[PDB]
Structure 1
């Protein structure tokens, strides 16, 4: 089905006439006059005409000595469990000098929507190894918990740390990581790729590395191939897969570029009107399924432009995911690592992650007292340094000492320090040991005599 009937070329777009049997979103292959091959997809098909957008652009293409070949299938991914320990690009091609994979089956990267009644609610606990996250904003198998960051902030280190510390208390080998890099600089990618090589975290993970200079359509297809591989490993092979994706801001800009190229009317702040739905076709691919062992958990990492949370990219992401983990410059300046602000950040499904059998008995109780005291402790710390000094009814003064200690000893653990939930809970009590017994009303008297020093 090869046609040399290219009628028109405008920008990245291309029109092919006298064709039939072609479909919507059908993947194509344009063989140029010089022999160079370029891939593309059908944006629209009408009559004998077919409107296609080429991935690598349309520069240097001679319409009359070039042919178009329709592959009769959408953008697919050849999946196999030999993908573990392999580095791929945005389109599933090897990037690690490794032997090309024999796919057990090919899968449309768009996947399918999990039947809402077939869906099983997210349950059980994933130990990220980070106190601020594991304890207060608990991550759950099948949950959508994103990390909101900004430029210059260490979301890069936070990403790599979780990816190499992520594990379950289930068993030795049924957990995996799918790391998707989206439109990031090469330096950032090589940092990821080698930190995985150094720690040996590559041996249990699959990497899709897409760079900033890679064509825009390859940048938007990257997370869909990541989730496609993740869904395969989780639903077909019964693994607990954790999906790390960054940067979502790069994704939105790529989606923005593609939209305008297709002469589409933009929505708020120059972003596509379907920005919500497009992002939702990624994040909603996570969760547990009834009757099926394994799950898909996502941690979408994005940068908030101008640190503006009301920006479309964070705001829409918040409207989809089940909470968020927020990084702040105010804490990063204080040398806090990771700089996690536990007040504007939240986990919605932490109810399912905590509790005896999952974590120890006092998980739910301690997080309430730590959070409540920290809310009152910071303002005590803040009002002390602004107004007066060491004159805070001798009760807010110990809250001030609590808040500062909470930030520097509890939250600030370091990007290379793995904090098990046990060590976190024990540390939490030692921080609550500062205060008198009257302050911890949130915790019953029983747990106190059992854990409090």
Structure 2
């Protein structure tokens, strides 16, 4: 143990004349009063070593305080007893339940999966939400994020998915790994209560990091969660669904620790290595040849100023296979969940649809509904620019279509669980507004069978 502390500059501390200290090594700080405070090495030198204290540096006398180097980084204790438990960002118990004896301790950075070892996403995931299941299908092993904004109900959305998500058939059922990143207690308490009230907790593992928690803990949170996820999926053969929020808060913790090392930022004040960082996180998903389980990621982020060009939604869309987008315009109109299907995309939907997974009219009706909805909004706009009179009788239908599409199809409620059968047959009832003539993007092999 070293009682050799040189400087304290803010929450950052300089420990001198050490040796064998590694980067990102966990440390322990015993202050003069006996109080124990834990920290992590951010920078390590010749004979100096810089650390950040998680719980701050208030009331520290450095001449009289010592530092212990734990000789290991942030690790995660894993067991199959994690299911049904609620932890904090570091993976320590938060539910006041029977403490867990880990099987082994793993590093939380994972591994880069060999390109020729990955397996294609195959299975359709029923989220129970029409706007997602039908128009932007989630497939087992995908990374399909949710682009939201401040004051937007992504909270209620995330809770709904975690609650309704299921695969058809496949009796072996889901392990939800929910990670909360730098959110308020009031919101974390919502998630924890919602999981208990419905019983989703018993098939779930929670990593709950709060807003006034250490930045270092916010950063480790999604890495810990995915580590537990990969353990359950690739060692225990479970199919794992990972929901993380808020990703925007993750980048901010990255910036805070980046400025400590005096690193000159890149685009819009974010680290140059943000891409690699986010890539390292979001790529930890999918299937692997010769293994049973899977990892499915739904990263949730809040776009600052509702701006899609912002680094965080911009770089995430590069790594993830599509995105679900929540708009304020839909929210303000009472549409919940406020999913705007037009900028929304699922790049793997073509894999989790069709007979044997969903009905044969899935990909077909999706395209038609998407088209008619765009023609509906154009029609509604026409009736304002030119007026009532310029509308064709086919235009008035398309307008009425989009209005019903928003208020009946998209607007289902955060507690309504729709089977893909109910969703598909709903989408047909809406196409029934249109004359059979207009549905030209579907075959009439399919049309004569399902058209109301």
After TM superposition, is the score higher than 0.5? yes
CA distance in 1 between partners of 2:59 and 2:160 (Å): 44
CA distance in 2 between partners of 1:66 and 1:115 (Å): 47
* TM-aligned CA deviation for residue 166 of structure 1: 0.8
Q: Do 1:391 and 1:397's aligned partners in 2 also have CA atoms closer than 8 Å?
A: no
* TM-aligned CA deviation for residue 43 of structure 1: 2.0
1:374-430 deviation line (CA, Å, top 9, x unaligned):
111111122124431164221111111111111111111011100111111111111
Q: Which runs of 5+ in 2 are unaligned?
A: none
| Stretch moving more, 42-51 or 120-129 | 42-51
CA distance in 2 between partners of 1:101 and 1:361 (Å): 47
Counterpart position of 1:436: 435
Q: Do 2:43 and 2:261's aligned partners in 1 also have CA atoms closer than 8 Å?
A: no
Q: Do 2:382 and 2:390's aligned partners in 1 also have CA atoms closer than 8 Å?
A: no
* TM-aligned CA deviation for residue 202 of structure 1: 0.5
1:266-286 deviation line (CA, Å, top 9, x unaligned):
112222222222111111111
- The 3-state SS of whatever aligns with 1:43 is strand
1:223 aligns with 2:222: yes
- The 3-state SS of whatever aligns with 1:142 is coil
1:69 aligns with 2:68: yes
Q: Do 2:127 and 2:166's aligned partners in 1 also have CA atoms closer than 8 Å?
A: yes
* TM-aligned CA deviation for residue 51 of structure 1: 2.1
CA distance in 1 between partners of 2:443 and 2:63 (Å): 80
CA distance in 1 between partners of 2:317 and 2:377 (Å): 25
CA distance in 2 between partners of 1:273 and 1:22 (Å): 26
CA distance in 1 between partners of 2:367 and 2:355 (Å): 17
- The 3-state SS of whatever aligns with 2:64 is coil
* TM-aligned CA deviation for residue 310 of structure 1: 0.9
Q: Do 2:397 and 2:433's aligned partners in 1 also have CA atoms closer than 8 Å?
A: yes
1:202-248 deviation line (CA, Å, top 9, x unaligned):
11111111111111111111111111111111111111111111111
1:427 aligns with 2:426: yes
Please report the RMSD computed on the Cα atoms of aligned residues, expressed in angstroms: 1.3
Q: Which runs of 4+ in 1 moved over 6 A?
A: none
| Stretch moving more, 26-35 or 195-204 | 26-35
Structure 1 pair 58–125 and aligned structure 2 pair: CA distance change class (3 A): same
1:38-79 deviation line (CA, Å, top 9, x unaligned):
222222322232222222222222222222111221100001
CA distance in 2 between partners of 1:145 and 1:157 (Å): 17
CA distance in 1 between partners of 2:56 and 2:172 (Å): 43
* TM-aligned CA deviation for residue 17 of structure 1: 2.3
CA distance in 2 between partners of 1:71 and 1:261 (Å): 22
- The 3-state SS of whatever aligns with 1:68 is strand
| Stretch moving more, 51-60 or 419-428 | 51-60
CA distance in 2 between partners of 1:141 and 1:32 (Å): 49
Q: Do 1:390 and 1:397's aligned partners in 2 also have CA atoms closer than 8 Å?
A: no
CA distance in 2 between partners of 1:203 and 1:377 (Å): 44
- The 3-state SS of whatever aligns with 1:395 is helix
- The 3-state SS of whatever aligns with 1:159 is helix
1:171-215 deviation line (CA, Å, top 9, x unaligned):
333311011111111111111110111011111111111111111
Q: TM (normalized to structure 1)?
A: 0.97
1:143-186 deviation line (CA, Å, top 9, x unaligned):
11111111111111111111100111143333110111111111
Matches within 5 A, 1:377-388: 377-388=376-387
CA distance in 1 between partners of 2:87 and 2:137 (Å): 30
| Stretch moving more, 25-34 or 368-377 | 25-34
CA distance in 2 between partners of 1:122 and 1:74 (Å): 33
* TM-aligned CA deviation for residue 118 of structure 1: 1.2
Q: Do 1:137 and 1:345's aligned partners in 2 also have CA atoms closer than 8 Å?
A: yes
CA distance in 1 between partners of 2:393 and 2:76 (Å): 63
CA distance in 2 between partners of 1:48 and 1:330 (Å): 57
Counterpart position of 2:131: 132
Counterpart position of 1:147: 146
| Stretch moving more, 314-323 or 36-45 | 36-45
CA distance in 2 between partners of 1:32 and 1:100 (Å): 28
CA distance in 2 between partners of 1:239 and 1:360 (Å): 26
CA distance in 2 between partners of 1:115 and 1:440 (Å): 44
Counterpart position of 1:206: 205
Q: TM (normalized to structure 2)?
A: 0.97
- The 3-state SS of whatever aligns with 1:164 is helix
Q: Do 1:381 and 1:404's aligned partners in 2 also have CA atoms closer than 8 Å?
A: no
CA distance in 1 between partners of 2:342 and 2:328 (Å): 14
Q: Do 1:143 and 1:297's aligned partners in 2 also have CA atoms closer than 8 Å?
A: yes
- The 3-state SS of whatever aligns with 2:371 is helix
Matches within 5 A, 1:75-224: 75-224=74-223
CA distance in 2 between partners of 1:170 and 1:23 (Å): 48
Q: Do 2:124 and 2:352's aligned partners in 1 also have CA atoms closer than 8 Å?
A: yes
Structure 1 pair 387–260 and aligned structure 2 pair: CA distance change class (3 A): same
CA distance in 2 between partners of 1:104 and 1:406 (Å): 51
CA distance in 2 between partners of 1:170 and 1:181 (Å): 30
Q: Do 1:12 and 1:261's aligned partners in 2 also have CA atoms closer than 8 Å?
A: no
